[PDB]
Design a protein around this nucleic acid. Structure first.
Lengths: 92, 74, 92, 83, 76, 78, 92, 91
DNA sequence: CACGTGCCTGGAGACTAGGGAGTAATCCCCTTGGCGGTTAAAACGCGGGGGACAGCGCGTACGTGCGTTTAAGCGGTGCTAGAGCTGTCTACGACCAATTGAGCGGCCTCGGC
DNA sequence: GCCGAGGCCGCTCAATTGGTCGTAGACAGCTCTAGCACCGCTTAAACGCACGTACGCGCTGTCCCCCGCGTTTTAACCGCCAAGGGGATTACTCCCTAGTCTCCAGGCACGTG
């Protein structure tokens, strides 16, 4: 009835650490963290779209939001991962 | 660390001055208690730093006052 | 019938993120590379938090992440603490 | 049913345990009243914002989301009580 | 202003060199940066003075600045 | 170029804040603090310049960068 | 070309202090102050309609934004003035 | 007539209305929202200008300069918390 | 708490139809660079006295233990206020076309600092 | 005394007033969840008092290291000129995304070793 990132967080866990599990409360906390980060990036992207009078939200807006809301090394690695994903999606 | 029922009474007393005939959820009181305990523990950490600065071990109200001054709280 | 998450190489749902960006009234239009960029940044962030939490749990000779272990991941890495500020985790 | 003098429900051992968890080794006898005052100011801010949110939604009950949003306005993100 | 303009402009350019090569700066940008920087340093020095007075002193040392920054939250 | 923020400039800034006597080791720490502050602000400003496809840093970029830090600045194009 | 709050601020100034004038830079600072407050009270009124699935910014949203942005006594006086203005507008 | 005379306000209701429409804040703006920002954006201007004029009187001047506005912001407990750490050019 | 099975609501493919963003050309401002003079500020050395820091002794006030007293936590019962959801209708706000005066740039003129 | 604040004047891009349309919000009803009030017993935490010694704090002395001053050095700053990148605006063609319907499997709950 309610949409949560439980399956995907479980998959990411199974990739980073194959021998550790998650309690239900830990899944709730991780879901809250993901929603908070998503809201923080979406609101910033909306503000940048509104300030520049841009009707649409593109990958460049999200890249700037990432570089503005995350600290340094996290921002660099996130930008690298996002550009990799966008290139792999456009090419294929 | 804080007893649940006295904290509930204190929260209701404070809320009375803002809107009368007000009701609470248990989750609300639990959230307020968690936040208050975390805030006080952080304040005591900064107070201990201020006390260590002045070459003593016993924390005193002036340490709290200085920590809240630097923090920007009024 | 290949999903947009499979075209990019992600586990997070690109389509769900796009639908969240479209019904949240962030901008009247949303591009094709914005759903694929958040779905990668969020995946990287979840992987980082899960890796640190799993390390904390493994150091405590446990094999199942519990809410206290997340509060030790975010309160040892300076970047996560600067990203979330004063973060208090329930049952931690 | 007037409520008064409930600030003394934050007993001396409670403040003392909070200070111990924060690393304090010695506590002067004047810390307690200051702790009551500081806690009262913090609670007043949070409860004011929470009641504002409650009265926005046309409700007579303060819910967990109201307190969570009030704390988030203060840069004190809280997880585990919903979202 | 308490800082000379040319050294501050050179410092700003030197710092910005590490984020992107071949930047140009407007005069208004350097002026705003200088104003903000001076205000920040004055506030930091006020807090440092309170810290120094707390330790029964009139001469400020780096430990005072470190304590002020740590309570503020800038250094962690 | 950090040495351009000289000893008397730091001393004048301290006197503006009310400091009566300044130790000899304050200057290096002040220079480090100033470098950190400028690094943060200029990082945000350069991000904003990148968003606009520009090669010049404008006053509005610095104003927005300082607003992200709770350092609201008035009189430079608000 | 550039719309500014210049006549209005002067009119308000010649109501509280009829004998004190004001400089152009003070116009700049007051216009910036009014803009900052306006975007604060508009951003916090849009976030109180989005997080309620309500497509309208009514006077109730503006009142909640006023009570959430301004400090205590300032907020009380502001809500009093706004309620007075809305009552006068609806009546006449 | 005008929408500011109905509310007895000195600030533009219509200009605020379009600023709150064309800014894509929400799809629909109410009729009482622009007459509530205008009445709040005028009390705040009145308070700041009153404090600035008081500062100008204390300095034996007939004009409000940026320095007076900075003094008014710093002395008022409430206005300092609303704006945070505000640096005013030529202050 | 993993793991298996049925279901149903939302993501995907294909298509067509407007309108926003990419992209090329132009104008003319603002930034960057160089140079020479003056001159205000920075740098260096020095003498001294103000203050930082260590040591020491006193007596105040904290911490720990022990016996007593308070009231908090728990578990049941009872009742009603009001949260959440659904349905229906009237009223309010977006749109668009005509009307008309408030507000913005330019000027000239004139008194506070 | 004179240069930045004040009043006057012409001119375009709003704000208003008036209608019409569709749908969002106010309002009435009803169903069940959960928040408040109460009671009784248990017992853990708070409280008051006493005693000892840990350490805050005032005083004294010594060395060192900032501060004010005088002199020499240096590079900030003002003024001027040149030259040219790139910020700001506009005109066009084309590719991206919103809205729709058909097709079907990923992802929510629920029962399981």
């Amino acid at each position: 009835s309610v949409e949560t990132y439980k399956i995907y967080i479980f998959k990411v866990l199974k990739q980073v650490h194959p021998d550790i599990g998650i309690s239900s409360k830990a899944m709730g906390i991780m879901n809250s963290f993901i929603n908070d980060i998503f809201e923080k990036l979406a609101s910033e992207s909306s503000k940048l779209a509104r300030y520049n009078k841009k009707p649409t939200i593109t990958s460049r807006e999200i890249q700037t939001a990432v570089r503005l809301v995350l600290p340094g090394e996290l921002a660099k690695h996130a930008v690298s991962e996002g550009t990799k994903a966008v290139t792999k999606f456009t090419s294929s | 660390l804080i007893r649940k029922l006295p904290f509930q009474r204190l929260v209701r007393e404070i809320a009375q001055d803002f809107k009368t005939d007000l009701r609470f959820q248990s989750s609300a009181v639990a959230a307020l208690q968690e936040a208050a305990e975390a805030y006080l523990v952080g304040l005591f950490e900064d107070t201990n730093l201020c006390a260590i600065h002045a070459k003593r071990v016993t924390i005193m109200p002036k340490d709290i006052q200085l920590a809240r001054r630097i923090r920007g709280e009024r | 019938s290949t999903s947009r998450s499979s075209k990019a190489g992600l586990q997070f749902p690109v389509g769900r993120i796009a639908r969240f960006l479209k019904n949240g009234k962030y901008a009247t239009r949303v591009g094709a590379g914005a759903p694929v960029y958040l779905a990668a940044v969020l995946e990287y962030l979840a992987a980082e938090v899960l890796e640190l939490a799993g390390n904390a749990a493994r150091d405590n000779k446990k094999t199942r992440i519990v809410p206290r272990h997340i509060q030790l991941a975010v309160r040892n890495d300076e970047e996560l603490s600067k990203l979330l500020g004063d973060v208090t985790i329930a049952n931690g | 049913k007037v409520l008064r003098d409930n600030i003394q429900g934050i007993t001396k051992p409670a403040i003392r345990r909070l200070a111990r968890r924060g690393g304090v080794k010695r506590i002067s006898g004047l810390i307690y009243e200051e702790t009551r005052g500081v806690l009262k100011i913090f609670l007043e801010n949070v409860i004011r914002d929470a009641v504002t949110y409650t009265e926005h939604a046309r409700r007579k009950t303060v819910t967990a989301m109201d307190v969570v949003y009030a704390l988030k306005r203060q840069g004190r993100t809280l997880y585990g009580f919903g979202g």
